[PDB]
Design a protein around this ligand. Structure first.
Ligand SMILES: *[C@@H]1O[C@H](CO)[C@@H](O[C@@H]2O[C@H](CO)[C@@H](O[C@@H]3O[C@H](CO)[C@@H](O)[C@H](O)[C@H]3NC(C)=O)[C@H](O)[C@H]2NC(C)=O)[C@H](O)[C@H]1NC(C)=O
Ligand SMILES: *[C@@H]1O[C@H](CO)[C@@H](O[C@@H]2O[C@H](CO)[C@@H](O[C@@H]3O[C@H](CO)[C@@H](O)[C@H](O)[C@@H]3O)[C@H](O)[C@H]2NC(C)=O)[C@H](O)[C@H]1NC(C)=O
Ligand SMILES: *[C@@H]1O[C@H](CO)[C@@H](O[C@@H]2O[C@H](CO)[C@@H](O[C@@H]3O[C@H](CO)[C@@H](O)[C@H](O)[C@@H]3O)[C@H](O)[C@H]2NC(C)=O)[C@H](O)[C@H]1NC(C)=O
Ligand SMILES: *[C@@H]1O[C@H](CO)[C@@H](O[C@@H]2O[C@H](CO)[C@@H](O)[C@H](O)[C@H]2NC(C)=O)[C@H](O)[C@H]1NC(C)=O
Ligand SMILES: *[C@@H]1O[C@H](CO)[C@@H](O[C@@H]2O[C@H](CO)[C@@H](O)[C@H](O)[C@H]2NC(C)=O)[C@H](O)[C@H]1NC(C)=O
Ligand SMILES: *[C@@H]1O[C@H](CO)[C@@H](O[C@@H]2O[C@H](CO)[C@@H](O)[C@H](O)[C@H]2NC(C)=O)[C@H](O)[C@H]1NC(C)=O
Ligand SMILES: *[C@@H]1O[C@H](CO)[C@@H](O[C@@H]2O[C@H](CO)[C@@H](O)[C@H](O)[C@H]2NC(C)=O)[C@H](O)[C@H]1NC(C)=O
Ligand SMILES: *[C@@H]1O[C@H](CO)[C@@H](O[C@@H]2O[C@H](CO)[C@@H](O)[C@H](O)[C@H]2NC(C)=O)[C@H](O)[C@H]1NC(C)=O
Ligand code: NAG
Ligand code: NAG
Ligand code: NAG
Ligand code: NAG
Ligand code: NAG
Lengths: 425, 120, 120, 120, 28
């Protein structure tokens, strides 16, 4: 005595794991093309999903693999209209500098506004951007790829990007504080866009980021597997203080009609060493915090060492500061088995950034003095297999995992059929 | 864009939940363009089922296809006062394609009975 | 995408037939993009006539415009039991624009008679 | 594309007015492409309100929300036989968002009263 | 191109020429 019939329901709370395209939103220009994003809602609405537990997985997210490709496209799109440095691949004649950080004063023949005429101009080149031929030197990139120097009007200033989901889709934000990054989450709410995520490119140390609300939380996939990158997220931010002291000057050449290669001029004043300062008893205070959480997963003494070795970008705290790309040596930061500490940094002008198949950018010399202050909110270690952790980091996309671990994209299936005692008369 | 308020009661029972311009092909422009096309595609994707089942403009439309007990053996107290719309879908997700075809033809046979009825 | 099953009875009589993501502007991407836009355009192109004639969500809707015999002089046995929907269109394709305007206003005058009726 | 004939009576009273293929990303192609997307977006933008208010396929649909006199104090002779639809909007444009939410829920509560009515 | 024939249809030539290199001022 029921007489049940199918009933169609439009707008039922049910979703499905899915991947789609996420468009960008910004607030009220730099490389990230934030002028092209729609204005963010000044009141970001959030709908709490009571009684809902959803399974996240920060390591098998697509927001990461999609944001990583967007930043690389934002990078390459901004270098399209800039000047190519093909003629800068000429034979350099270099000498040393003054009676670490080696600098050379290199003279070379260069083209001009007119094809038949040349010019004998000289420039300063950091030793790391230049190899010897065997003193005739050569730019380190000329044998593998060309280089496009940055349009000096654009900035690499990382400003918050809001990734939004299309109409008919949704984003699930895990709000549990001690969320491991993977597994069920008991405090789940839905949002249309993520928060303001700054595309801050760095290595080993994660600069300018979101902190842990309490207790330094550690995230990974297979902790027992050492090939999987570990990601630390600090609770209190230690402040790193970087500066390139040398007062550089910009000297603009003219390698063609409209093509102006900006060369490193003279060094007005003293010649010092670029470096960074972070506070002892604060890096030591926050390293015993990361320490006691590393042992919660590994029973045992834990050791800190330096990077393994190889390329410069892999084995250094490579980041950006005022326009120039530093390469700081963090052997003095990870050196404790469980007043300042100064990191000697070198500065490169020929950078490959995304480790791509033959594409570099000449960072023009910023005139004046450079100094930046950055929070150190995160970390990325690498175990060996005495549980030592060396500051590695694996890939670059792990930067975006440290901020996207709370979000997950699902699609709405608002159609549902269920039996009721009504019949269409 | 529309609303995620439907989703407010995702953990509630089935009886509680139911009750500027210019195009520029920049990396963000192409991104924001497909989001606009992907919205109207997924919207009409659902909205054409509602139309072909004779339920356009309706939130809750009763049909004429009886509930085949092989789709679910649970009681009306076990469904509307226990299961949530999210988990009820997983139990019935096998017959959803088998049910969507019956509602599609129940509307079709209702249309020819009306063209014979209004002919009097 | 939808169905070409309607087309199954293209030679049958009128009484029998009636009864991943990411956008890339590659040569195939631009090709597949316009196909997506050309679908929703042609779909709503038909679906707005059904709405403006008061027939949204309907497969067969009866109207109130009488059949002007100058459109066709054939018998109901000569139409539904002889001609196919493909050839019947060619015979009446002259007055299709003249008929679509009458169904458009028969719905419009029906709407104002309802706003006067439900006011009691 | 559709019609600007609605606009014929923009100065008349409210009672009188109511009564080839291939995509090429050239500067004109991108221009003509967004016009096609901007049309179906603005069209469904209005057409989803009509659907969610239980008025799809309707030109004039009566609702069940009483007229709160704080929205307008004018007489029925002061409205339909005096004001034009263009200026009446400016007077009521404050409560349009407050009215659109009442018609949205009057339809929603009507749907659950029907699922209880047809269950007999 | 500065070409010579091949060996003591399908004719093949062995051509030597000046060509640019990784550096603009040098040739090969
Ligand atoms: C170690 O590195 C520091 C870089 O961070 C060097 O610079 C000193 O940093 C201090 C910390 O900010 C500055 O003191 C701050 O001054 C401001 C201005 O009034 C106050 O708001 C801060 O509270 C205060 N902070 C503290 C902890 O007192 C110093 O002013 C600044 N030095 C100078 C010359 O300005 C340190 O010099 C460096 N130490 C060594 C030994 O190398
Ligand atoms: C990072 O380090 C730099 C340098 O170590 C810090 O800059 C220093 O900031 C203090 C802030 O008061 C400056 O002190 C003031 O200087 C002015 C001008 O000389 C003087 O009139 C005041 O009486 C006072 O002494 C200090 O000059 C400045 N030093 C330099 C070299 O610029 C910076 O604050 C650090 N950022 C942090 C810790 O976040
Ligand atoms: C981490 O965040 C801090 C602050 O958000 C960054 O410091 C900021 O650095 C930029 C330059 O890189 C400063 O902005 C610009 O400075 C130049 C030079 O004078 C000027 O021409 C511009 O108009 C603009 O002012 C900015 O002032 C500075 N912010 C603060 C608060 O001092 C830091 O660079 C970030 N770290 C990384 C690795 O991105
Ligand atoms: C471009 O130049 C770099 C730098 O010389 C090459 O890397 C070198 O490869 C040679 C192989 O004979 C080694 O002897 C050097 O030790 C390498 N240098 C470094 C820094 O690793 C690179 O292989 C060259 N690219 C191509 C395509 O030839
Ligand atoms: C670096 O960290 C400090 C400390 O967390 C940040 O300063 C905080 O900013 C928030 C947001 O306005 C305030 O609510 C806190 O009161 C601030 N704390 C202190 C001690 O002032 C700072 O904004 C961070 N900067 C960057 C670039 O990440
Ligand atoms: C770096 O060196 C330049 C000179 O190459 C300095 O520029 C001078 O700055 C003073 C500031 O009082 C001006 O009055 C002069 O006109 C500037 N000279 C030129 C040629 O522009 C600059 O001040 C130095 N930087 C610092 C931080 O001292
Ligand atoms: C790099 O070397 C060149 C030499 O070719 C230096 O240019 C000389 O500078 C002195 C000092 O002003 C002048 O007297 C000479 O006439 C310059 N020679 C030429 C050929 O221009 C240049 O100063 C050096 N760069 C730096 C930063 O010291
Ligand atoms: C980073 O700095 C440390 C010192 O702060 C350097 O350590 C030295 O490394 C050499 C090469 O193996 C050793 O022979 C020395 O004994 C080390 N000195 C120490 C530990 O005080 C290290 O080489 C630097 N690395 C880079 C890449 O610059
Ligand atoms: C410029 O080229 C000439 C030959 O044309 C050469 O003698 C001279 O040394 C070159 N100068 C440089 C490379 O600075
Ligand atoms: C993270 O925590 C969750 C708790 O739900 C657990 O199931 C998972 O195994 C943990 N993973 C790691 C890598 O710690
Ligand atoms: C979820 O997070 C909110 C944030 O304020 C908090 O108030 C609430 O108690 C949390 N609920 C649970 C079950 O953790
Ligand atoms: C590492 O620590 C030891 C002991 O404190 C010290 O002697 C050594 O110089 C440190 N190395 C670096 C690179 O700071
Ligand atoms: C290369 O150019 C020189 C003149 O610069 C010429 O004498 C020589 O014959 C050329 N070699 C070729 C074309 O193989």
């Amino acid at each position: 005595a029921e007489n049940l019939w199918v009933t169609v329901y439009y707008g039922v709370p049910v979703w499905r794991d899915a991947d789609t395209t996420l468009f960008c939103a910004s607030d009220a220009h730099n490389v990230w093309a934030t002028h092209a994003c729609v204005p963010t809602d000044p009141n970001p609405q959030e709908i709490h999903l009571d009684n809902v537990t959803e399974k996240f997985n920060m390591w098998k997210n697509n927001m990461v693999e999609q944001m990583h490709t967007d930043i690389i496209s934002l990078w390459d799109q901004s270098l399209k209209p800039c000047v190519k440095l093909t003629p800068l691949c000429v034979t350099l004649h270099c000498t040393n500098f003054n009676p670490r950080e080696e600098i050379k004063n290199c003279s070379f023949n260069m083209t001009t506004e007119l094809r038949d005429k040349k010019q004998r101009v000289h420039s300063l080149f950091y030793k790391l951007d230049i190899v010897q031929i065997n003193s005739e030197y050569r730019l380190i990139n000329c044998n593998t790829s060309a280089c496009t120097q940055a349009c000096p009007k654009v900035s690499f200033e990382p400003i918050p990007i809001h990734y939004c989901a299309p109409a008919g889709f949704a984003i699930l934000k895990c709000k549990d504080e001690e969320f491991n990054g993977t597994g069920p989450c008991k405090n789940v709410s839905t949002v249309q866009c993520t928060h303001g995520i700054k595309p801050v490119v760095s290595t080993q140390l994660l600069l300018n980021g979101s902190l842990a609300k309490k207790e330094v939380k550690i995230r990974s996939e297979n902790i027992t597997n050492n090939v999987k990158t570990i990601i630390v997220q600090l609770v209190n931010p230690v402040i790193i203080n970087c500066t390139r002291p040398n007062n550089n000057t910009r000297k603009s050449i003219r390698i063609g009609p409209g093509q102006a290669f900006y060369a490193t001029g003279a060094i007005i004043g003293d010649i010092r060493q670029a470096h960074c300062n972070v506070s002892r008893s604060d890096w030591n205070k926050t390293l015993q915090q990361v320490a006691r959480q590393l042992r919660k997963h590994f029973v045992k003494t834990i050791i800190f060492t330096n990077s393994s070795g190889g390329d410069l970008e892999v084995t250094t705290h490579s980041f950006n500061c005022g326009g120039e790309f530093f390469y700081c040596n963090t052997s003095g930061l990870f050196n404790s088995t469980w007043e300042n500490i100064t990191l000697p940094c070198r500065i490169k002008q020929i950078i490959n950034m995304w480790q791509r198949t033959g594409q570099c950018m000449y960072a023009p010399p910023i005139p004046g003095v450079i100094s930046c202050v950055s929070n150190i909110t995160g970390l990325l270690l690498t175990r060996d297999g005495n549980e030592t952790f060396r500051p590695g980091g694996g890939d670059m996309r792990d930067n975006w995992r440290s901020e996207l671990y709370k979000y997950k994209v699902v699609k709405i299936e608002p159609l549902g059929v269920a039996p009721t005692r009504c019949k269409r008369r | 864009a529309v609303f995620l308020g439907f989703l407010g009661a995702a953990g509630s029972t089935m009886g509680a939940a139911s009750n500027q311009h210019l195009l520029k092909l920049t990396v963000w422009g192409i991104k924001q363009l497909q989001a606009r096309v992907l919205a109207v595609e997924r919207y009409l994707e659902v909205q054409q089922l509602l139309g072909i089942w004779g339920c356009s403009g309706k939130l809750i439309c009763c049909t004429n296809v009886p509930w085949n007990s092989s789709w679910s053996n649970k009681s009306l107290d076990e469904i509307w006062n226990n299961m949530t719309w999210l988990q009820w879908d997983k139990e019935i997700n096998n017959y959803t394609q088998l049910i969507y075809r019956l509602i599609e033809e129940s509307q079709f046979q209702q249309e020819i009975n009306e063209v014979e009825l209004l002919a009097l």
